[PDB]
Design a protein around this motif. Structure first.
Motif, PDB file in Angstrom:
ATOM      1  N   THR A   7       0.844  -1.195   0.000  1.00 57.61           N
ATOM      2  CA  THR A   7       0.000   0.000   0.000  1.00 57.61           C
ATOM      3  C   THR A   7       0.879   1.245   0.000  1.00 57.61           C
ATOM      4  O   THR A   7       2.090   1.161   0.224  1.00 57.61           O
ATOM      5  N   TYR A   9       1.066   5.699  -1.533  1.00 58.11           N
ATOM      6  CA  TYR A   9       0.517   6.786  -2.329  1.00 58.11           C
ATOM      7  C   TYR A   9       1.253   6.884  -3.655  1.00 58.11           C
ATOM      8  O   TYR A   9       2.484   6.888  -3.701  1.00 58.11           O
ATOM      9  N   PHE A  14      -4.098   7.143  -2.940  1.00 64.42           N
ATOM     10  CA  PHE A  14      -3.776   6.003  -2.094  1.00 64.42           C
ATOM     11  C   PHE A  14      -4.028   4.744  -2.919  1.00 64.42           C
ATOM     12  O   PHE A  14      -4.978   4.688  -3.702  1.00 64.42           O
ATOM     13  N   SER A  16      -3.809   0.229  -2.892  1.00 69.14           N
ATOM     14  CA  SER A  16      -3.719  -0.981  -2.099  1.00 69.14           C
ATOM     15  C   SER A  16      -3.751  -2.146  -3.060  1.00 69.14           C
ATOM     16  O   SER A  16      -4.650  -2.246  -3.894  1.00 69.14           O
ATOM     17  N   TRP A  51      -8.636   6.760  -1.782  1.00 67.12           N
ATOM     18  CA  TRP A  51      -8.299   7.654  -0.682  1.00 67.12           C
ATOM     19  C   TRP A  51      -8.119   6.941   0.651  1.00 67.12           C
ATOM     20  O   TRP A  51      -8.672   5.869   0.885  1.00 67.12           O
ATOM     21  N   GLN A  52      -7.340   7.568   1.526  1.00 72.83           N
ATOM     22  CA  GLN A  52      -7.063   7.058   2.863  1.00 72.83           C
ATOM     23  C   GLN A  52      -6.869   8.272   3.767  1.00 72.83           C
ATOM     24  O   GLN A  52      -5.827   8.927   3.719  1.00 72.83           O
ATOM     25  N   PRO A  53      -7.882   8.600   4.587  1.00 73.85           N
ATOM     26  CA  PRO A  53      -9.163   7.895   4.693  1.00 73.85           C
ATOM     27  C   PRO A  53     -10.214   8.394   3.703  1.00 73.85           C
ATOM     28  O   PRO A  53     -10.059   9.457   3.098  1.00 73.85           O
ATOM     29  N   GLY A  78     -14.171  -0.540   0.627  1.00 73.58           N
ATOM     30  CA  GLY A  78     -13.495   0.087   1.742  1.00 73.58           C
ATOM     31  C   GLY A  78     -13.855  -0.513   3.079  1.00 73.58           C
ATOM     32  O   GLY A  78     -14.613  -1.485   3.164  1.00 73.58           O
ATOM     33  N   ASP A 170     -11.911   4.124   7.021  1.00 70.82           N
ATOM     34  CA  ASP A 170     -10.513   3.807   6.764  1.00 70.82           C
ATOM     35  C   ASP A 170     -10.346   4.051   5.256  1.00 70.82           C
ATOM     36  O   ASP A 170     -10.883   5.035   4.742  1.00 70.82           O
ATOM     37  N   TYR A 171      -9.665   3.167   4.526  1.00 73.91           N
ATOM     38  CA  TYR A 171      -9.503   3.403   3.094  1.00 73.91           C
ATOM     39  C   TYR A 171     -10.776   3.205   2.271  1.00 73.91           C
ATOM     40  O   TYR A 171     -11.682   2.465   2.662  1.00 73.91           O
ATOM     41  N   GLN A 172     -10.835   3.905   1.142  1.00 71.02           N
ATOM     42  CA  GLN A 172     -11.976   3.882   0.235  1.00 71.02           C
ATOM     43  C   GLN A 172     -11.385   3.938  -1.164  1.00 71.02           C
ATOM     44  O   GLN A 172     -10.864   4.969  -1.580  1.00 71.02           O
ATOM     45  N   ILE A 173     -11.446   2.822  -1.881  1.00 71.97           N
ATOM     46  CA  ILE A 173     -10.868   2.753  -3.218  1.00 71.97           C
ATOM     47  C   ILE A 173     -11.801   2.145  -4.248  1.00 71.97           C
ATOM     48  O   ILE A 173     -12.856   1.616  -3.913  1.00 71.97           O
TER      49      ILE A 173
END
Length: 190
Positions: A7, A9, A14, A16, A51-53, A78, A170-173
């Motif tokens: 993971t 940037y 962001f 993963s 994005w994170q977060p 996410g 938390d993360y959103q991808i």
């Protein structure tokens, strides 16, 4: 660039990338919010940018090509903490509907299509905090697509009406998940 699982940037976004170690998967971080995944007779993998977060009102844009050859999903994916929740807003999938074996709670109209809402529980499964028990929320799009815009608020609100209270995002991808299949994809997130 083509990388091993991890993971970080890349070009402002962001990313993963994870796989079960089976092989047959190639993840490459492209320019801007772009990433490409090419797999053949792979195992299980999840890769994407975002994005994170993440937020609960973010309007996510994605465009590109998604060519699954078997079991695979393209979705806004996410996590949440307190409560620990793993969620999916599926925009397109291959031969297997991920909602299979899930309990339908309702329906929601968002961004040009109706979505079916589901919930499943994962007992003692790995998560962002290690092995734990958590609920898995789903929003499966009826009209499949590989380009569009997702207003996450419409989904989070519909889920909240069904008895879901998201905590810390938390993360959103925008991720491409494959399950012992083949395919290719090049998606750009904005």
């Amino acid at each position: 660039q083509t990388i091993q699982p991890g993971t970080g940037y890349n070009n402002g976004y962001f990313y993963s990338y994870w796989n079960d170690g089976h092989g047959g998967v190639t993840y490459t971080n492209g320019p801007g919010g772009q990433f490409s995944v090419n797999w053949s007779n792979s195992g299980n993998f999840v890769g994407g940018k975002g994005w994170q977060p993440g937020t609960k009102n973010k309007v996510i844009n994605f465009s590109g090509s998604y060519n699954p050859n078997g079991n695979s999903y393209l979705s806004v994916y996410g996590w949440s903490r307190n409560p620990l929740i793993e969620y999916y807003i599926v925009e397109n999938f291959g031969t297997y509907n991920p909602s299979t074996g899930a309990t339908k709670l309702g329906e929601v109209t968002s961004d040009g299509s109706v979505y079916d809402i589901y919930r499943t529980q994962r007992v003692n499964q790995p998560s962002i905090i290690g092995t734990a028990t958590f609920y898995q929320y789903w929003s499966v799009r009826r009209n499949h697509r590989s380009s569009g815009s997702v207003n996450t608020a419409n989904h989070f609100n519909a889920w909240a009406q069904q008895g879901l209270t998201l905590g810390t995002m938390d993360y959103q991808i925008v991720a491409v998940e494959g399950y012992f299949s083949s395919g290719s994809a090049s998606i750009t997130v904005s």
